[PDB]
Amino acid sequence: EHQAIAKMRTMIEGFDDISHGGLPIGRSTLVSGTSGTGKTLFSIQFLYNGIIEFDEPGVFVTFEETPQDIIKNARSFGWDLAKLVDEGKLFILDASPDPEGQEVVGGFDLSALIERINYAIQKYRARRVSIDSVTSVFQQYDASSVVRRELFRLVARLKQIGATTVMTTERIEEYGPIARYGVEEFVSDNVVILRNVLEGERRRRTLEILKLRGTSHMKGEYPFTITDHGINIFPLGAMRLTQRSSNVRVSSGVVRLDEMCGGGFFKDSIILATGATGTGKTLLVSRFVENACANKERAILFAYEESRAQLLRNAYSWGMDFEEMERQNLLKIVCAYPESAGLEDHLQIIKSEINDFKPARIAIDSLSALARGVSNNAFRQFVIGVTGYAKQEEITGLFTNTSDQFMGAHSITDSHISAITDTIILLQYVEIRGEMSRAINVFKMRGSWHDKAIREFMISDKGPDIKDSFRNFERIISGSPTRI
Amino acid sequence: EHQAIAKMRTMIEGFDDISHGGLPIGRSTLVSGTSGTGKTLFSIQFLYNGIIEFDEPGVFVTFEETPQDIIKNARSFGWDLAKLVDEGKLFILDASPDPEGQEVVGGFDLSALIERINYAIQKYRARRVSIDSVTSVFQQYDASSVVRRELFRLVARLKQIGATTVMTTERIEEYGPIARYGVEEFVSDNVVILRNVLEGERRRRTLEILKLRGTSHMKGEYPFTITDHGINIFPLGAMRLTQRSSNVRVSSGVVRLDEMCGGGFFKDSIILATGATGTGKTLLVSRFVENACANKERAILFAYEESRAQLLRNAYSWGMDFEEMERQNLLKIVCAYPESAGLEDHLQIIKSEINDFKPARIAIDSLSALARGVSNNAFRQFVIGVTGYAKQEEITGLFTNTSDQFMGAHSITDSHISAITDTIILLQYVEIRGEMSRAINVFKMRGSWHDKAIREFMISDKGPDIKDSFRNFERIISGSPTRI
Amino acid sequence: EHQAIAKMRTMIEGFDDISHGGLPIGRSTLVSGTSGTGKTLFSIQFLYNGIIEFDEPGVFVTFEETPQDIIKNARSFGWDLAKLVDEGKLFILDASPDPEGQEVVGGFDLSALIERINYAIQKYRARRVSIDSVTSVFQQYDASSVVRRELFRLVARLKQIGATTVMTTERIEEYGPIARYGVEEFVSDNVVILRNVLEGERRRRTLEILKLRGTSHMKGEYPFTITDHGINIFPLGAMRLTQRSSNVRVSSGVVRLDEMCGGGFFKDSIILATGATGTGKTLLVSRFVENACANKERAILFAYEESRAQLLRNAYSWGMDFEEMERQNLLKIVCAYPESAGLEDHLQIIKSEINDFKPARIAIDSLSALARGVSNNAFRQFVIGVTGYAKQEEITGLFTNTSDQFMGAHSITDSHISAITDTIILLQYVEIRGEMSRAINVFKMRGSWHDKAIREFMISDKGPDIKDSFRNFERIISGSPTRI
Ligand SMILES: Nc1ncnc2c1ncn2[C@@H]1O[C@H](COP(=O)(O)OP(=O)(O)OP(=O)(O)O)[C@@H](O)[C@H]1O
Ligand SMILES: Nc1ncnc2c1ncn2[C@@H]1O[C@H](COP(=O)(O)OP(=O)(O)OP(=O)(O)O)[C@@H](O)[C@H]1O
Ligand SMILES: Nc1ncnc2c1ncn2[C@@H]1O[C@H](COP(=O)(O)OP(=O)(O)OP(=O)(O)O)[C@@H](O)[C@H]1O
Ligand SMILES: Nc1ncnc2c1ncn2[C@@H]1O[C@H](COP(=O)(O)OP(=O)(O)OP(=O)(O)O)[C@@H](O)[C@H]1O
Ligand SMILES: Nc1ncnc2c1ncn2[C@@H]1O[C@H](COP(=O)(O)OP(=O)(O)OP(=O)(O)O)[C@@H](O)[C@H]1O
Ligand SMILES: Nc1ncnc2c1ncn2[C@@H]1O[C@H](COP(=O)(O)OP(=O)(O)OP(=O)(O)O)[C@@H](O)[C@H]1O
Ligand SMILES: [Mg+2]
Ligand SMILES: [Mg+2]
Ligand SMILES: [Mg+2]
Ligand SMILES: [Mg+2]
Ligand SMILES: [Mg+2]
Ligand SMILES: [Mg+2]
Ligand SMILES: [Mg+2]
Ligand SMILES: [Mg+2]
Ligand SMILES: [Mg+2]
Ligand SMILES: [Mg+2]
């Protein structure tokens, strides 16, 4: 690796990519954020992984949380630090005050502390050190100048010993100064900022490596989630554009359509189905799913508009029995409101379910539903994310999109995802003789030829029946054609 | 223990969903909010439910409000604490100052206080403790650093006694620091934020669990309302997408309509009637209510546009007698201006009326009326609300929508709810031979077949007469056809 | 007293509707706001209304203004305080400092005053007290901490005393902290905020009951005014949708029009005349107002576009004499530019005059003129106000609206009021053979059946003459027809 600085791996999903390999060894990383951002979690996970993956003893210095609590809280992610303390791989160095205390101590303690820590490190042959809430130590009565010396002194001796350190710091504003005293930022070798931005009553956690003296790294903010497994990062912009592509074809579930697509959809492709309410995107999805099961293949249907029940009532009405699909353990239906969590979550949920089910086909009914509230920029990042995972996973995926206006829609999508998709399937109403008839169309395909006709189609208990084109009409797209 | 972190239930409607079980046992939780946000209410309702639901004795430490008052006010919600005091189930520890104050009390009190609290905890075998305004205590002449210690101490000692406590703190900026000294947030293991956000002369009460060291919890803000039954929170993002579905139909009040819908509306469905003013949605709504009492069933009509008297005058003129409807106790008309309150409130009023009247059918005349002033995201949240609640209750609901523009409308809804609804009914004006005639169209029906025609219809004393389509016109969807 | 919180009416118009009863008895209510928000006025009008409505003596404690001025000023609203002081009903407890003095007199008088006050309370059998500018007292040299103690002592004492008080406080920002020391907020049992919101060089006073401990109240801000009869608040959200409705008919003033509305306008209804400039709204208004005089009924015409003198001319050129109308005291013209006062002030002026002339009919020439500048929500809130009052007052109302664009207007009103109105009349230009001809059209009626034809009409010295429809045309609504 062409980087001048030797790094250690956090083994924290996504972090090592963001930091181009992990935390510089022998240095210290300031990890700061507002309340409940995941600082303690980040540092504990840092020592944990260190012990489990590389047998690297760790020293956890705590200034506010009690050693029992640090061990009790860790059980939230099924981590047993008590077992590690007994094995002598983890040492929690208690430096929290006692509920009786006095006044004055943040100085010689800084010298006593260093000596304490050098003892633990030497005794336990420690390779990693995280210092949780150093902020609270000189949070006794100090100014910025006194803080710079004490921190620098701490960091400096830690570097002499050779310990790779992680120091947590608190902030009050999500975007203003990096840390409380506006001094930590510059004493540290590297700086990580954990945010938890509000905006729209939802909460989005992001991680940012602001600086790493010596090497490069990914810049900006990256979304993450805390789970029963700790921190989980998606470097959405680290996603390389090297997806495998094959000319393999797969049916859509509708024979006539497959012809229209010049032999069916591609396996390695993303399909977009757009049209106004009532056109039949939801239907098309059903048929897309069923076909994956009719060939003994798994498929997931992430529904964001219809209940699990309704999805069954309507599917049966179109024939195709979903009950059996789930029993045979070939079709897995999800279902959840887009307002039940921000995009990151939705993205992460979609991924796990893709891992705990090895789907060959996936269907997200209504991206345009996920687009509610969120800003366009946030949505497209979401669309690149789903769309990208699916691609690198040889997982054919059909996406749905309802257009904000029936008849007259000038754009295939109000979100402008169009270029992100390989094959687009357009549905639309046609006002013919006082009636609302449907018309299906294969607008585009990248590897195939595809039919260029705008066929009309009817929906029956049997399903979608693709008929013929309105040859004798003008302005079909307008929605209100003229008979010529 | 060798497991995660046990939680205690607060029985506060909604909160135990948001917290994934309730408050972390053996720990304290900082509940802070600006003036009048519900901090005290929350703390009394935490003790109260702990007594009345599990018989867990409670201690209430008060620092400003007098014990007599605290009991006086609880009456507001039909809470008799004085009774619980006598039964030794609840103990109100008066720590409030006397009208003849004295200097320096930042230590004697700290341990003298715990001494008392502990004494009380042991005496009444209290399981719950809630302290009101710990803020006021060091509001004598202290700085953040001194504040941090005192809380660290108060919090630490309570832990030792093993008390599951609720601590109240006051703010000053709805989105400024979480608490008065920007320190409390980091000392507490758990933090709850209660907000009374202004915005457009209206106030919206929300609740957020910023963090609970040790476990998971729903993130973000959640709207709640303080009623005669205390705090009521609506985790609008917790409602699952597991609504029950069936092929059971229900008439509309319009037989020709029922025909166009393939045999009537589904009971388990959401219908939406859109069109310009004058087309006839308020009509379709009455014709809906009636049909619910002719089959001796109970229905509620939430009107926000026309008064109660008018709804009657116009209903009689269409025939159907609303008078009898009410007497027979099968029909209940509410009526109230959308400006009379905020969305959160309206949503609740809708629900409580559904509970006290066991409705079969429900209709909201003009969702678009409720969309006045309020942002779009707030509205959809409302629509998802009243919509899913109905869906899961087996309630057949009809929702009215008045598109901003007569003729030319390119979208069924300006708000864009058309995708959350099951069946869409479209009314529109059609300029014919210098005349303004109507038309009706069953735009979409998820489970049924429904008529695809745009039938013209007249309105008389008898009601709505759905005639034929204009099979000899072009561009009818535009309002100004072209005879051919 | 083991009952809910009992309140005491302030008799301040509107306040008792918002506060669900009035100020809670025996408790102190904080009332703060920026300079000149009506603070003093409030407390004072609180002690007055008491003396004159329930003969409850009152004690007024002033710390800055002199008793002479407090009385001299009250004269601004026709309140002879001087008299009430004599009749021992009101006692003004001067507590203002003199041009000379000393210092180091902190809580010294705070204790002495709580006596002087108790004195006058018993001495005059006082039930209501009001302390104007408590803030100015510790505005000598205190910190937030010293302020919280002094206020708690005072409030506590007055509470023991059993007095129902109103304490005045000053703010510096309309939307920042509640009171100067951000401490009063929490010390008070009730907090009311008076705001004098600037915004576009226009000032809008609003009052808000932030909290009332132990009881319910209306949330949010509320516009109010300061007139010669004291504070006047309009609970526009409190107005119920319980308006009386009848099938009585009345005449538009245009026979042919009445026929079209199927027998005329309903007495209990609101008519909206919509059209581009020149169409003729001011004509219908003229005609509508004249008709109420022909039947010796009183009617008011609130003109916001044309002057008194001009209305006369143009109306005499149409026949109808407005001169006699006024002599016969059957017609009352108003006239004022919308720019001569905020919506709040207009709405009131509209109401006051309706009370000083018992109108049976009402005409507002150009709602769209009142819509100038003001935001859309602030407008609808004015429409609903005027619309409602008229409605519950059995007064027939005709409101005019000029659409922003002539020909092609795709919406009746730009402000969207159309769903707030019972009867919609639509005037429009029709380009036929290179000439601009008119057309009248009864868009909708909630009771009657009305005509659906779009009839062209012409204006002469006789007034409006409704002719025929354009049966042989196409795209009339558009304004640029096509003959078939
Ligand atoms: N199993 C879990 N799943 C999801 N979230 C969790 C889980 N366990 C803890 N959390 C969340 O992790 C956060 C706890 O923060 P954490 O313990 O990482 O330290 P911190 O927020 O950085 O600092 P502080 O000590 O000031 O709270 C909380 O927001 C909490 O809800
Ligand atoms: N049994 C059936 N027989 C005939 N037509 C049906 C039947 N079921 C559904 N349909 C038709 O299909 C439409 C249902 O739309 P569908 O579920 O396919 O998804 P969509 O229109 O793409 O998206 P959305 O959920 O927004 O409606 C109805 O509007 C209706 O015309
Ligand atoms: N029965 C009730 N129904 C509706 N709202 C009520 C009722 N009783 C009280 N309220 C409202 O509840 C709020 C009272 O807040 P509460 O006393 O619980 O705590 P706080 O204001 O956050 O803190 P503190 O009381 O110590 O100042 C006020 O907004 C009040 O008007
Ligand atoms: N007795 C009647 N006979 C014939 N037509 C009537 C009668 N009453 C009302 N109408 C017609 O019905 C329409 C009334 O509309 P309705 O009250 O049904 O609700 P809407 O148009 O959907 O919404 P809103 O009128 O509140 O804006 C009028 O436009 C009118 O043409
Ligand atoms: N007759 C009146 N008509 C219209 N406005 C009036 C009349 N009398 C007084 N006002 C207005 O009323 C307000 C008087 O405010 P007031 O003295 O009651 O309280 P304040 O200014 O809020 O606080 P403080 O007087 O303690 O400084 C001013 O804005 C003034 O212009
Ligand atoms: N004596 C008259 N003879 C013929 N037509 C007249 C006469 N007076 C006015 N008109 C016509 O009536 C129109 C006057 O409009 P009017 O006063 O009725 O109000 P408006 O058109 O509704 O609103 P606005 O004030 O914006 O013009 C003129 O544009 C003109 O065509
Ligand atoms: Mg934190
Ligand atoms: Mg921490
Ligand atoms: Mg769908
Ligand atoms: Mg309280
Ligand atoms: Mg309407
Ligand atoms: Mg209506
Ligand atoms: Mg849709
Ligand atoms: Mg002033
Ligand atoms: Mg308070
Ligand atoms: Mg005019």
Author numbering:
A (entry chain F), B (entry chain A), C (entry chain B): 14 to 497
Question: What do the authors of the reporting publication say about this deposited model?
Answer:
The circadian clock of the cyanobacterium Synechococcus elongatus can be reconstituted in vitro by three proteins, KaiA, KaiB and KaiC. The crystal structure of KaiC from S. elongatus revealed a hexamer in the shape of a double doughnut with approximate dimensions 100×100 Å, whereby the N-terminal CI and C-terminal CII halves of subunits are joined by a 15-amino acid linker. Two phosphorylation sites (P-sites), T432 and S431 that are both located in the CII half were identified in KaiC.
To analyze the phosphorylation patterns of KaiC P-site mutants and to visualize potential conformational variations in the vicinity of bound ATP and residues 432 and 431 at hexamer subunit interfaces, we determined crystal structures of the S. elongatus KaiC single mutants T432A (TSa), S431A (TaT), S431D (TdT), and T426N (nST) and the double mutants T426A/T432A (aSa) and S431A/T432E (Tae). b KaiC mutations xyz or mutants KaiCxyz are sequentially shown in order of sites x = 426, y = 431, and z = 432 where the wild-type residue is in upper case and mutated residues are shown in lower case, i.e. Tsa or KaiCTSa, where the residue at position 426 is T, the residue at position 431 is S, and the residue at position 432 is mutated to A. Interestingly, in the structure of KaiCTSa, A432 has moved closer to the γ-phosphate group of ATP: average distance 5.6 Å vs. 8.2 Å (wt-KaiC).
